[PDB]
Subunit: 264 residues, 4 copies
C-alpha cells in the first residue's frame, strides 16, 4: 500500500473566470476574475497592483494591464492583502516578468518567502511559488506611488500578516475613499486554544474593530462575495455593496457563532 499521491489545490470554476477590466473609480480598476479581486491603480508615474489571485492568472493579469496601456515595465509596486495561494499566487512570476517590487509586512513577507508552506492552519496543503518582499512596512506606514498614497492597516487574523489598504481616488472630481479589507474568515481554523496561533481570538476581535473605524466610502474584498460585490453585472457591480461597519459586524457574528459551535 503506497504512500498517497499529492493533491492539487483545486478551486471553484468561478475563481478562474477571466473578466474584462471593470472600473471602480477614476484611477482604480479590477483586472482579476469573476470571484477573485486583482486591483490596478494607474498613476502618472507607474501602476500599482493589489493582489493577483491564483498562480495561473499571471498571464491574464498581464493582458488586462496591457489593455490599460500598462506595459510590464510600468508596474512599479505589488501590494498584498494576505499571502495565500488564491491571493498572492502569481507574485513570483509577476516579479520575474514585470520588474515590480513587493511591499508587505513582516508576517506576510515570511509567509510569502516559503510559498505558503507550513501554514498555521493548512500546512503544506496549499503552496505557491515563493516570492521575496522588497520593502518591509509597519502598521500605519504610507506608501506613495505617483502621488497616490496607500496607508497600511494591519488586521491580524486570517493570516498573521493580514493587511487592509486605504487610498483616496476620484470619481470625475469627487474624491472617493477606497478601503481594501482582507478576509475576516476563519475557514476550519481552530480558534480556541491554538498552539500555532495562541492569541488568535484577541487578534481577530481587534481586527473587527480596526475595519469598522476605516476611512472608507467604497469597500472591496479579495473575494467579492465578502463585500457583496458582483463583478459579473458590470456597472451595477457595486450597487448592493456593504459598508465597513456592516462587513466587520457580519464577520464578527460568524466568528462568535464559530467559537460557540467549537465549545461543543
Amino acid at each position: 500500500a503506497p504512500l498517497p499521491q499529492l493533491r492539487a489545490y483545486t478551486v471553484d470554476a468561478s475563481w478562474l473566470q477571466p473578466m474584462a477590466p471593470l472600473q471602480v473609480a477614476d484611477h482604480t480598476w479590477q483586472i482579476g476574475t469573476e470571484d477573485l479581486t486583482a486591483l490596478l491603480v494607474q498613476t502618472a508615474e507607474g501602476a500599482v497592483l493589489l493582489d493577483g489571485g491564483m498562480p495561473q492568472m499571471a498571464g491574464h493579469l498581464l493582458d488586462n494591464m496591457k489593455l490599460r496601456g500598462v506595459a510590464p515595465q510600468d508596474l512599479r509596486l505589488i501590494l498584498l492583502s494576505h499571502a495565500h495561494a488564491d491571493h498572492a499566487g502569481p507574485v513570483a512570476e509577476l516579479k520575474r516578468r514585470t520588474g515590480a517590487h513587493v511591499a508587505a509586512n513582516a508576517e506576510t513577507a515570511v509567509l510569502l518567502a516559503r510559498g505558503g508552506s507550513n501554514d498555521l492552519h493548512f500546512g503544506d496543503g496549499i503552496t505557491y511559488p515563493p516570492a521575496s518582499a522588497d520593502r518591509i512596512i509597519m502598521d500605519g506606514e504610507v506608501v506613495t506611488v505617483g502621488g497616490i498614497a496607500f496607508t497600511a492597516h494591519f488586521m491580524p487574523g486570517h493570516t498573521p500578516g493580514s493587511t487592509a489598504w486605504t487610498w483616496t481616488d476620484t470619481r470625475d472630481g469627487k474624491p472617493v475613499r477606497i478601503a481594501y479589507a482582507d478576509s475576516l474568515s476563519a475557514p476550519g481554523y481552530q480558534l480556541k486554544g491554538n498552539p500555532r496561533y495562541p492569541r488568535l481570538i484577541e487578534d481577530y476581535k481587534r481586527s473587527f474593530a480596526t475595519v469598522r473605524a476605516l476611512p472608507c466610502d467604497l469597500l472591496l474584498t479579495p473575494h467579492p462575495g465578502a463585500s457583496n460585490w458582483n463583478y459579473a453585472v458590470g456597472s451595477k457591480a457595486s450597487a448592493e455593496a456593504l459598508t465597513c461597519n456592516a462587513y466587520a459586524d457580519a464577520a464578527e457574528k460568524k466568528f462568535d457563532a464559530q467559537l460557540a459551535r467549537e465549545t461543543a
Copy 2:
C-alpha cells in the same frame, strides 16, 4: 574631498570583558560578558542559548559552553530578545559552528535576515553577519526543549520583534520563575510622528503593560544595568535586582520624559 570612510560599531570596553560562567538558577547560567547577557540553559536533551552579545563573542561563548560540558553539537536552539548587533551578533557564526536552530518571530527574523541593515532608527550604522530564522513563532507560543518550556511574550518597542522569554527553573528544589525581558529603551528614537514606525507610541505603552504582568520571580535583561544586575560581584550579583513592575515603571518614566522633551 573624498567620500567618508566607514565607521566601525565600537562599544564600551565593559561590554567585551569576558567573564566566567555565573550561575543564575539550577539550570540557568550566564556565559556572556560583564555588561552583556548571554544565557545558557542546560536540559537533559540539549542546551538552549538566549542572546549572544557582540559578533566577536562567538569564540568566548563556545569556551563557556565547553566549560559547562556542552559540546558544539549539544546546542539545540538559539532564542533571541531583539536582533541588533550588540545582542544577536555571533548568531550567524554559532549556527555554522554548532548546528543549532534559531527561533524568533517574524519581525525579528526579517531583521536578522538583513544583518540589522536598514534599521528603522540606526540605518546601516550597525550591521552584523546575517543569519536565518529556522522556526517562526507567534505571541504566546511555547517552545519546549528537554522538558523546559519557553513561552514568548512580544513587547514591540525597541525593535518591532522585541520578545521577552519566560521559563521556570529550580533552586535546589524550589521552582524559580525566570523572565528575560528585552530593553525598553528608545536611544535616539524619534517617538512622535515617526514615518518608519508610525504606531511606535502605542506599541511602547502596550509593552510597558506586558512586562508588568509577567510571571516572574527573578528578572534578567540583555544589559544587566537595566535590571540593576551586577555580573561582576559573582554570587551577590542578583542582590539589588529590580522587579517586573519596577523595571517597566522606571522605563515608562524615562519614556514619558523623552516624549515630553521631544515636544520642545
Copy 3:
C-alpha cells in the same frame, strides 16, 4: 471558459512504496522507498541523510530512522544530490522536525530556496516546500561528520547544482568506497541551443567524464534502476549493479542519441 485548474505532481506507485531499512554497508543504510533512494549513515557523533524522496515521505523517513536507533535530534546533516521535488522533497519538513543542517552547493541552494519553482526545464510544474541551505560547499570540499568524510563532486547537468557524493565505509573490516552519483538523464530537456541553460552540452559531457573517474567500489543512484539496483530483492539488491564507467558510458550513449534525435 475558465483558466485551467492546477495539476498535482503525480509519480509512479513504485516511488511511494515504503520499504524496510536495507543495509548497504556497515554504516550505510537505505531508508527510502522501493524506487527512491534515501541514504542514512550512522556515525558515532550523529547521522547523515542523503536525499529523501517525495515530500510526503517525511513521516516514513522518520520511522526508518527511529528503527535504526536514531532520534530526530540525532540527524545532524542533510546532503542532497539535486534539488527536485522527487529527491529533495521533505527537506523543509525534516529541518523543522529534526534540527538538522542542509549542506548543498550554490546552484542547489538557490533552487532549494525557491522550492523547485522556475525550473530551467519544468517551470512551476513541480514544486515542493522551500528549504534553506545552512552551509555552502564548493567542488571538492570535504564534509566530515563523526569521522566519516563526504567529498563533493560537482556534475552539472540534470540541474546546475547536481552533486555526486563519495565516502568510504566498511564491510566487516573491508573498506568499501561508496559513490552516490546523481541522475545523468535529460528528460525532455532542450539540449541544443537552450537559452536558460546555454552551456548545457559541455556541462553534461564534463559530467560524464567526472563520474567515470570516481573512487568507487559500489555505486548508488537516486533512482535505483539507473544503477540497476533492485531494492525489492533485499540482500541480492546489489548483485547486478553497474560500475562507474558502465553508468556514465550508458548515460552518454542515451545523451548522444538524444542530441542527434533533436537535430531532426
Copy 4:
C-alpha cells in the same frame, strides 16, 4: 583584557574620490569614483547599472544618474562583477531607492545574500548590507534591456561567482565591443590546498583562458588600474588601456609567481 573592538573596512582615499560622469562609448558611461568603476548604460527602455563601488557611494551614484537624465525609477537592472564590499556595496540601498532588479549567478547571489559575510578568504572582515538577487543567470545567458544585449561569461576565481560582461555599443556609428572583465587577482588567497576552495587553481587557469578569448575591442575592469585605465585624465583615460590577451596574460604571470612563492 577585553575582547577586541570591531575594525571598519577602510580603503584608499582614491577609491572614494567622486568624479563626474565620463563617457566610454555612445551609450556607456562611468559614474563611480576615480579608482572604482560604476558603469551606466542608457537604453531607450531604461538604464542598466554594472557594479557600484563602496556602500557609501549610493548617494553619489544617484547624482550622476540624475545628471544623465535618469530618474531613480528609470534604473531597471543592476549587473555585478563579483559581490564584495568594494564593488557590490550600495546594491541593497539602490534596490530600496530605485526599484531596480539584480541579475547575478548563483554563487554571486548566495554571497550577496549574506552581505559578503563568511568570505572564503576574508571571513567577516568585509561586510556590506545584504541584497537579494532577482534573476538567476547561467554561463552564456543573454540579458537584453532596451535592445542592448549583455552576455555573461563566468570567470570563477577571485570569487566563485565572478562574471565578465560583454555588450556591443556604438561610437558615432562604429560598433564597439565592450568587455567588463572581473579582477583576476588573488590578494592573500591561499592558492595551493585551500579547504574552502579546493579547485581554486584550475578555476583560475580556466578563467585566464576565458578572458583571452573574449569579444572585445575596449576592456574595462572594476579597478581601472587593472586595465591601465586612468579615469582622472578625462578623455585620454582610455589611451594606454590593455587588451584582453594582455590583461589575462599579465594576471597569469602574477598568479604563477604567487603560487611558486607559496611553495617556499
